[PDB]
Paper text:
DsbA from E. coli K−12 (EcDsbA) was the first and is probably the best-characterised DSB enzyme to date. This 21 kDa periplasmic protein is a dithiol oxidase that catalyses disulphide bond formation between consecutive cysteines of unfolded polypeptides as they are translocated to the periplasm. EcDsbA consists of a canonical TRX domain, a hallmark of proteins involved in redox homeostasis, with an inserted helical domain. The TRX domain harbours the conserved active site CXXC (C30-P31-H32-C33 in EcDsbA) that is featured in many proteins of the TRX superfamily. The acidity of this groove originates from a cluster of negatively charged residues (E24, E37, E38, D44, E85, D86 and E94) that map along a buried channel in the interface between the TRX and helical domains of EcDsbA.
DsbA K58A and double-mutant E24A/K58A were crystalised in space group C2, with two molecules per asymmetric unit. In comparison, overlay of chain A of wildtype DsbA and chain A of the E24A/K58A mutant showed the smallest difference, with an RMSD of 0.34 Å over 174 Cα atoms. In all three crystal structures, a glycerol molecule, used for cryoprotection, was modelled into the electron density. The binding of glycerol displaced w2 in all three structures and hindered precise analysis of the water network in these mutants. However, the double-mutant E24A/K58A yielded a rate constant of 1.47 ± 0.06 × 106 M−1 s −1, 35% slower than that of wildtype EcDsbA. Mutation of two or more of the E24, E37 and K58 further increased the “disordered” solvent content, reducing the structured hydrogen bond network between the charged residues and the w1–w4 water molecules. Indeed, both E24A/K58A and E24A/E37A/K58A mutants displayed significantly lower thiol oxidase activity compared to the wildtype protein (although the more reducing redox potential of the latter would also affect its oxidase activity). While native DsbA rapidly oxidised the substrate peptide (in less than 10 s), in the case of the DsbA double E24A/K58A and triple E24A/E37A/K58A mutants, oxidised DsbA was present in the reaction for over 10 and 20 s, respectively.
Residue numbers in the entry: 1 to 188
Write the structure that this text describes.
């Protein structure tokens, strides 16, 4: 078949009940995640092909970067709570990997301030139990899919994308294959 278990995707041996329909995991420290988001625009291209009523969810992971990695998971929870993911994704990726100006929790906060989030609003969110819950939710989801590495993407809590089984001849064809595989899986 054109789509094959073991080729473009794999099947979780322990499917996750109640998982977001399309769930991506990433780290702002992950070089492949930087390529996926800033050069290939994987997330945007997946979203443009999702069936009606299917949304993408993206969660950060703790296992890269020690202390700062966990600060970034908490800041990503702030971005999700405030609805500012689209304002901070590029400067967080660039701050960590391009300019390497993000070295502390305060430096993360500066990205939000420069993006127009008010200081009091950031600090209230950072310290909130809503954000504590969103950190726990990102951690629980990674545990539930037995996450090993990033980037990763999971569909319906049952299928894991396998980019290494896709055609990497051309970067844009690869992005197309990835997005079309997510759509195929969301309809399975």
């Amino acid at each position: 078949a054109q789509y094959e278990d073991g080729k473009q995707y794999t099947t979780l041996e322990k499917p996750v009940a109640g998982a977001p329909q399309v769930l991506a995991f990433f780290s702002f420290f992950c070089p492949h995640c930087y390529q996926f988001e800033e050069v290939l625009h994987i997330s945007d291209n997946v979203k443009k092909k999702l069936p009606e009523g299917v949304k993408m969810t993206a969660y950060h992971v703790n296992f890269m970067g020690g202390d700062l990695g966990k600060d970034l998971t908490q800041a990503w929870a702030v971005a999700m709570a405030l609805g500012v993911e689209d304002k901070v994704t590029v400067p967080l990726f660039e701050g960590v990997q391009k300019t390497q100006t993000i070295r502390s929790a305060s430096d993360i906060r500066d990205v939000f301030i420069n993006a127009g989030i008010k200081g009091e609003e950031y600090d209230a969110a950072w310290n909130s139990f809503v954000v504590k819950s969103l950190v726990a939710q990102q951690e629980k989801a990674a545990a539930d899919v037995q996450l090993r590495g990033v980037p990763a993407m999971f569909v319906n809590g049952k299928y894991q994308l396998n980019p290494q089984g896709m055609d990497t001849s051309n970067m844009d064809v690869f992005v197309q294959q990835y997005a079309d595989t997510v759509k195929y899986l969301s309809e399975k």
